[PDB]
Write a protein that binds this ligand. Structure first.
Ligand SMILES: NC(=O)C1=CN([C@@H]2O[C@H](COP(=O)(O)OP(=O)(O)OC[C@H]3O[C@@H](n4cnc5c(N)ncnc54)[C@H](O)[C@@H]3O)[C@@H](O)[C@H]2O)C=CC1
Ligand SMILES: NC(=O)C1=CN([C@@H]2O[C@H](COP(=O)(O)OP(=O)(O)OC[C@H]3O[C@@H](n4cnc5c(N)ncnc54)[C@H](O)[C@@H]3O)[C@@H](O)[C@H]2O)C=CC1
Ligand SMILES: NC(=O)C1=CN([C@@H]2O[C@H](COP(=O)(O)OP(=O)(O)OC[C@H]3O[C@@H](n4cnc5c(N)ncnc54)[C@H](O)[C@@H]3O)[C@@H](O)[C@H]2O)C=CC1
Ligand SMILES: NC(=O)C1=CN([C@@H]2O[C@H](COP(=O)(O)OP(=O)(O)OC[C@H]3O[C@@H](n4cnc5c(N)ncnc54)[C@H](O)[C@@H]3O)[C@@H](O)[C@H]2O)C=CC1
Lengths: 371, 371, 371, 371
């Protein structure tokens, strides 16, 4: 089939959904690979690199979208792309539909078949395509939080690790999953005192063992959470219920009681944000004031480190890309339950129960479109 | 005597040279403490906090300077302050004279008595007043280097620590002293691959043992230095010869051979810079381009984390401040050889041999003005 | 000469001042070794073990004391032993004279020559005979503090290390020297959050590097000390000025503000105690109440682990014992400045300036009795 | 329904089965919470704290027991409570029935419905309600073992971690599960040389990886076990077969060959003890002599650290408490197989096969009382 990769268009989005190695393997398998001129430049993959791997370089986005049987992207379609969505095409990308009625409607109205990276899910419950991006975003949260704690950025003016004889920053991570663990690990490595909260005690045990208690763990009761947040210099929101809109765990009322110049990084912004005061920001304007604190709410954090994140992502997605190209969506999803869990839309039907619930929109069973 | 502390005026300088506790101890000893209204605000020390500790709050900088027998500052006098320097007054602050003929001339022409924090030196050869700032600056270099490696900042677009299956950043630290050790430690904590060079093998042996080889050490031969720099995503320049202009270790020719978007942080900029291409930048405009790389050359790095660095600095300086106030410069320096090594100017005479050599200016023996 | 070792008589004192190996080395050098029957039993060294090494086992303490030219002990003479002190005899033991006018007077009135283990001091300033006992006492403070934190012991009822999801104990160590470092290390190993204070920043810098920030370090300002103590579940007092009465750093007023059931272990009790409320306790009755807290003030902590501490002590003391036996006190002290610093009394003259100052008693120069 | 929490009555039992937060959530759900006056005081939860959360404070235990539909406790009913057990009430607490015919009979004769915390078991085989108490007891075993190794407690007189140049204690842990891992981790953190035995090699691999071999692992053959025990200063028994009486792994004959003053802590005492010589002790009298060793056999170890263990326990139990209150035992157990595995008695029927086998008492299938 024809596999198309357009240039990402979200603000400062430097990632691309395929590398030369993936192009070469698709072509080895009898597929036609179409790629918009310039699509890999953010990730230092020249048109010439893609050409040598076997891609057809096309001048415009409209052609990639029109010609592709399988359209591969990194981020969700944005408003200017809603018109490019079409019936009879497979879209494979991060979707975050529980967080956007407008995006969901556009997919449904177009009749396109869409599969979300972030709801592809193996039998152990893991999300193998979200995981590498959660790892990137977690590590970035720590480095971005430390930078914004500087007085010159409007922060409290506290050094992450302190220096001998002087207290370090107090960092609170909400969620001990992939992003939270990665945020905690880097923040701890920068010398901050790190506390991680979760409602899953198993995850806290795992963190306790891995750092031998150097990273503090607190069960996420209302009392522990509020107490930790009030004391924090930096809060990193990293909770998830797979495919769902993030729960609102930190109220604006709580934020009003925080130390002046504290920083809050809402990693969960891609699913709507786990802070009440969150709204999406971009790399051009990443922060805004809430009460006397600074919120950071970038829904495409890994975009700033494309040399790392393009590869991390495609190492994970490629086996799934190959099965979709070889067999088409129905046969691929039929053969792979994990893949099938990423199914989101098809011919105006919404195939995710959690998305349908969060948006208040009718749900149709995926088994129905697969049988 | 009268101990005066004016507001710092260098760009984005949020530190202050004393805290309420130091003010209280000075007043307990019969000293008059004069402080410019607003001087502690960058460090979250209000005029009211200084007042309660015993300070006289004065409206203008000119008064502090005119009235103080001992003038305490954080950074060197800048141009607009040259007219405030006076004969009969002791100035105790960071000076960096080997890096500024203009500052040195101003001190000499004023006839003031000046002692440099950074050349106060104990008999083991350590610089106890520079050390905590070198600790701050080293830790900041890692976090600031990581941030500027982001594509959105003009950098290469590589995450410090990578993620599983994908390479981390390659970090090179030149100098294994206080600043370099701290930069290496934080960069390593962020998951970067860190290589540290020095000409002092003892210092490399210490780093090797502390991290049991996780931080790489290379003797600083031309071959090792050039090779490490060409491979680096981030270079941190942290060399020092006490009180001297920094040696130029990284040529612009070498920089032309580096990877595009690499970042170079010149911590040694306060002493003139150890990179050939270095020139001082400010927190307002911290970076500039050299060839295809980004240089970061801020001479007052600890200013951005004043809640940490004001205290770190004053924990160290205060015992020296108390000796100078109790006994005056001559008797304090007679009693304390370490203090006496900080002696820089007195009545138009330049008292540092290393500074005199570097600037091409007459040297006068400090034992002569202490006899 | 005759080297005598009596049985220790302080409460629960299970240590002994020599082992079979030391006895054998003394006898190899032509010395007569006299040991009280039963002296080694606390340390599991039977009379038969000492006999086989060459010792003369004697039935009574009075004989050991009467016959010995060099008398080796572990702890200071107590009241019932004051009548055994004699002119012409060398006493070599822990003395702690700055803490006991009564002990000092007894030594002075007897005219005996005494050398204190704890003031023997090498040119680097280290106290090589105190050090291994400080190591023992520091490690014990952590384990004894943890035990007394149990509700069943009157303490707050908090587990040292917490468990995943639940806060650990907050431990504050005052003094970053041998005892404090060892207390911090063990407390941290038990999973407590440990903060260590000192006025010597060099020592904090060393702790910071050794644990890469896992043990918190705070410069010991009034503000940091008071704040840390109010938050603490367990406080360990481990400060020292060599040969001096301990400074009083924790007021009873501060103790009144602590959490109910907090535990305070005063390791510095042997030198008078660094807590205002401290008074010496014994292993039989180790604790007492101050306000709503529990104080632990045992002046012979290493006695409880004699299998460890007898050997640790004698590994260190023996080379000094051999010098004193071979050459006598005057020539040994003439040859070894470190040994000479332990000189405490001789023929009614007090030879330590620090002790003399603390007790308000005339000082006589040790160079005078060595000339 | 009515949820009742009486004061614990076992010796020195300071835990309570609910906290204010749990009370508040039960009341939010339409349940009536009854709590005996004083029940939370051991855990520093005042009657006023429980009152503010919504509980009815009742004067006597008899009323709590009579009125409660769901009775929540920490420990098993003791003799003086056997008369309070009633038909038509759900009891949810630690039971340890395989270790007490008398307790089992009382439950059976009363006709009450009982569910054991310690046999609630998820599909991975884990025991999520036992786990936090195993974590507490393991960590306590190390600290309690170290204390009793002191000569002043009748132990060998060896310091847990030794000091430089002198050997540390030799610690042997039997069982590499939750309690054993926690005991090993703390003992290692105190500087002891730790060896852990198990028949499950997977658990030994996990320990080997987590400490990179610093904690020794030995397959639990008769040879390795006997050899390790004879060499040990401290033995910690931490084996379990879920719901079963502990196997007797250390014979009195073996104990006769141990070093004099060795300490044995039998954590498995709650299930009957894994040492042949074990019998339950209390916090009032925790130890007794076997041959020349000291046995410690406290069946309610976490009771001494209630500020830690009350919260650890209730963080785990609460989701199960809520389901029992909302739906009653039959529907809750029907919906939750893990919960259903804790089913122990109902109307005179014993529902645990392992308990019935160990006691030699008839077994009835749980599916029979659930269908
Ligand atoms: N902003 C960005 O650019 C990126 C955002 N993300 C987002 O980061 C978030 C976290 O992702 P992962 O770490 O991979 O998820 P994960 O599933 O590995 O971890 C989520 C954790 O949150 C915990 N949790 C859920 N509800 C909670 C509550 N009410 N209180 C406390 N803890 C709670 C869960 O128990 C779980 O341990 C997701 O929204 C993900 O989409 C991921 C990559 C990039
Ligand atoms: N930009 C800023 O705001 C601040 C800058 N600094 C500066 O950082 C610099 C480093 O200071 P510290 O780490 O405290 O000094 P340090 O004396 O502790 O270490 C300097 C190291 O550089 C090494 N070195 C000297 N010449 C060398 C050569 N040719 N090649 C390789 N290594 C060489 C030395 O052997 C020494 O180990 C100084 O200029 C200091 O003033 C310090 C604080 C703040
Ligand atoms: N109770 C017992 O059985 C034993 C008690 N000790 C005692 O433990 C105490 C500590 O001994 P080491 O650790 O060997 O001494 P050390 O000399 O190694 O360390 C003492 C530390 O206290 C610090 N210090 C002094 N004054 C201070 C102040 N005002 N505030 C904060 N820190 C201050 C010093 O800077 C130094 O780092 C001594 O009194 C020693 O005799 C030692 C062994 C056994
Ligand atoms: N005394 C007290 O206050 C408390 C006692 N406990 C008890 O501690 C004991 C251990 O609990 P957990 O660590 O949670 O259990 P677990 O199931 O996590 O670990 C038990 C380990 O024992 C091993 N084992 C079983 N039979 C063995 C044999 N014959 N030889 C060698 N190893 C063997 C298993 O393979 C397993 O790894 C249980 O009896 C538990 O009820 C728990 C909490 C408090």
């Amino acid at each position: 089939m024809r596999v198309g990769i357009p240039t990402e268009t979200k603000n400062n989005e430097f990632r691309v959904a395929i590398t030369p190695a993936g192009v070469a393997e698709l072509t080895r398998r009898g597929h036609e690979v179409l790629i918009q001129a310039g699509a890999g430049e953010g990730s230092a993959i020249t048109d010439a690199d893609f050409k040598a791997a076997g891609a057809q370089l096309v001048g415009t986005a409209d052609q990639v979208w029109a010609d592709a049987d399988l359209l591969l992207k990194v981020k969700e379609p944005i408003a200017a792309e809603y018109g490019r969505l079409r019936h009879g095409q497979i879209l494979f990308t991060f979707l975050h539909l529980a967080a956007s009625r407008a995006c969901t409607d556009a997919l449904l109205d177009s009749g396109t078949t869409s599969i979300a990276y972030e709801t592809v899910q193996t039998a152990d419950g893991a999300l193998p395509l979200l995981a590498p991006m959660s790892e990137v975003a977690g590590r970035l949260a720590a480095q971005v939080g430390a930078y914004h704690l500087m007085r010159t950025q409007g922060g409290r003016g506290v050094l992450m690790g302190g220096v001998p004889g002087v207290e370090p920053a107090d960092v609170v991570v909400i969620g001990a999953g992939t992003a939270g663990y990665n945020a905690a690990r880097i923040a701890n490595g920068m010398g901050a005192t790190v506390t991680v909260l979760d409602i899953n005690i198993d995850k806290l045990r795992q963190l306790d063992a891995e750092f031998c208690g150097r990273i503090h763990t607190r069960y996420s009761s209302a009392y522990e959470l509020e107490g930790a947040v009030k004391r924090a210099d930096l809060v990193i929101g990293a909770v998830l219920v797979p495919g769902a809109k993030a729960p609102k765990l930190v109220s604006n009322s709580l934020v009003a009681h925080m130390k002046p110049g504290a920083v809050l990084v809402d990693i969960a912004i891609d699913q709507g944000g786990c802070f009440e005061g969150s709204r999406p920001t971009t790399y051009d304007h990443p922060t805004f004031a809430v009460h006397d604190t600074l919120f950071y709410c970038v829904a495409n954090m890994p975009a700033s480190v494309p040399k790392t994140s393009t590869y991390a992502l495609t190492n994970a997605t490629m086996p799934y890309v190959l099965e979709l190209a070889d067999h088409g969506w129905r046969a691929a999803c039929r053969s792979n339950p994990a893949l099938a869990k990423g199914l989101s839309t098809h011919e105006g039907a919404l195939l995710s129960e959690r998305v349908a619930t969060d948006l208040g929109v009718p749900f149709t069973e995926p088994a129905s479109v697969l049988a």
